[PDB]
Design a protein around this ligand. Structure first.
Ligand SMILES: *C(=O)C[C@@H](NC(=O)CCCCCNC(=O)[C@H]1O[C@@H](n2cnc3c(N)ncnc32)[C@H](O)[C@@H]1O)C(N)=O
Ligand code: NA
Lengths: 7, 328
């Protein structure tokens, strides 16, 4: 996954 | 001064854009120039307003990725420490203007077929700045290739390629990738039977199994040249360390443990941690078209299993490449 998400 | 979108994306190139990826702060498109695919990463910068629910990054915040992208790309043309395992960087531009209608079209097609977590980028004004990075098209990410690889012999080539690239970058640049999850590993078909690298002046080869691996995405990465360190200080980051549901999210915590939350230091063990996470994906989440039906294939499986259970006792990708039995 992306390390940080939209979210 | 900044250029118009037309400078990076003349009409024919713009007309051929298809969206391939996204994140909180960017959009990635594939297009074609001179009969060759390329990948374009587009990041809005410097504006006061929210994009995908977050503030825009400043140019200062994006500069490290630009620098690291260039340094790793240049490793293809070096002598003592040479690798083509990082993605080629073609150009970087600062662009000003609203989002092109042709990119919006591509954006809409992706949202219809795959779904986007991002806002439709149709609200930017004619003063908006962007950084536009153009890269070599590196193929398809490993995550999207979960069900598409031939066998575990392919997984071994992939791991060897990754370890070698990281070793060369350690040696040349004191590099740590720091975010090498399976969406940041790309695979492309190659006709070459073996791939070449040079580590501290010693040249070697790797059997390709028909694939060339490229590493991408340097937002969290760290390197240095002549004692000047370029890195992303995440010591005060409020959510990077609180993820769950994938070993990936443990790796951020295990990095923080290894470096005592001091991100400017060099701890090439982080590269080992990521390679262990990748090996774990190969053994647990990848599913192969051909299983290990023959004794010879059961042996490769056992060697990769042995790698998985031993590799965390090595100090760097360089240690792994030079000393681990898998690569003899
Ligand atoms: C940390 O906070 C980073 C932050 N980054 C961004 O938000 C910026 C946009 C990230 C885009 C993530 N998706 C991808 O990179 C996917 O696009 C494909 N891809 C990228 N580059 C290439 C190249 N050179 N060739 C082919 N395909 C490429 C690939 O499918 C990637 O997985 C964040 N939160 O993510
Ligand atoms: Na490359």
């Amino acid at each position: 996954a992306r390390k940080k998400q939209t979210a | 001064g900044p250029v118009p979108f037309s400078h990076c994306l003349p009409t024919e190139k713009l007309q051929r854009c298809e969206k391939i990826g996204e994140g909180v702060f960017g959009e990635v498109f594939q297009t074609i120039a001179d009969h060759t695919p390329v990948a374009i990463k587009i990041i809005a910068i410097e504006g006061p307003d929210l994009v995908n629910g977050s503030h825009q990054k400043t140019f200062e915040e994006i500069l490290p990725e630009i620098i690291i992208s260039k340094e790793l790309s240049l490793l293809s043309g070096e002598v003592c420490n040479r690798t083509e395992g990082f993605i080629g960087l073609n150009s970087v531009h600062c662009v000003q203007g609203s989002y092109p209608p042709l990119l919006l079209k591509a954006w809409d097609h992706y949202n219809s077929t795959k779904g986007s977590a991002n806002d439709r980028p149709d609200f930017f004004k004619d003063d908006q700045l962007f950084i536009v990075l153009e890269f070599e098209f590196g193929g398809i990410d490993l995550e999207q290739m979960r069900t598409k690889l031939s066998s575990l012999a392919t997984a071994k080539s992939i791991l060897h390629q990754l370890t070698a690239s990281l070793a060369v970058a350690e040696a040349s640049l004191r590099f740590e990738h720091r975010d090498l999850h399976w969406g940041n590993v790309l695979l492309k078909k190659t006709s070459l039977k073996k791939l070449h690298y040079t580590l501290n002046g010693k040249s070697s080869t790797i059997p390709s199994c028909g694939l060339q691996v490229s590493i991408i995405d340097y937002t969290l990465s760290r390197l240095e040249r002549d004692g000047i360190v370029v890195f992303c200080d995440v010591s005060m980051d409020e959510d990077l360390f609180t993820g769950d549901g994938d070993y990936q999210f443990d790796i951020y915590r295990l990095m923080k443990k290894e470096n005592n939350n001091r991100w400017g230091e060099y701890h090439p063990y982080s590269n080992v941690l990521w390679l262990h996470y990748l090996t774990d994906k190969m053994l647990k989440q990848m599913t192969f078209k051909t299983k290990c039906n023959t004794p010879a294939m059961k042996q490769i499986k056992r060697k990769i299993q042995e790698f998985h259970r031993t590799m965390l006792n090595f100090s760097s990708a360089t240690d792994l490449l030079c000393q681990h039995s898998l690569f003899k």
